[PDB]
Symmetry: C3
Subunit: 63 residues, 3 copies
């Protein structure tokens, strides 16, 4: 992966160190979760106004 190697290799020395792999992995886990949480958020917030009022939170219960 052209682009991908360049992302993980932060100092740009053409090599991917351990700290680098360990960092990318960490970074990736983070984003993945952020992304999932927001998807759930923007979801509950029906009127996408950025907040969840008692009603939306209320309409968010199937059992």
């Amino acid at each position: 992966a052209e682009a991908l190697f360049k992302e993980i290799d932060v100092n740009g020395d053409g090599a991917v160190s351990y700290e680098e792999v360990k960092a990318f992995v960490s970074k990736k886990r983070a984003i993945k979760n952020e992304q999932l949480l927001q998807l759930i958020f923007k979801s509950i917030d029906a009127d996408g106004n950025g907040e969840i009022d008692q009603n939306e939170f209320a309409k968010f219960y199937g059992s």
Copy 2:
């Protein structure tokens, strides 16, 4: 959930922000784990005196 919305909404402005959801989730994950760990602890500690001596720890091995 009456009580529940009030817990997640910390500043009490009637709304639940993203930071708020993200926080509650975090808080919840924490407690869940604490609770599980302790259940395992209080378990091994047969004489519930708050400590696990070599014997209890010893009697805690099925294979």
Copy 3:
């Protein structure tokens, strides 16, 4: 476990506290992951020279 109780019991008072269990668990989770990551690393790095060049990273893709 002879050796094991002594590892978890850090202050060496013959007892294993909660903080102690909670710590060992944490410590263990850490090592386990470090170990796995490295196994993946040393793996990709075919010439075990400590770095992963564009080629190895390149030869590391089955689909």
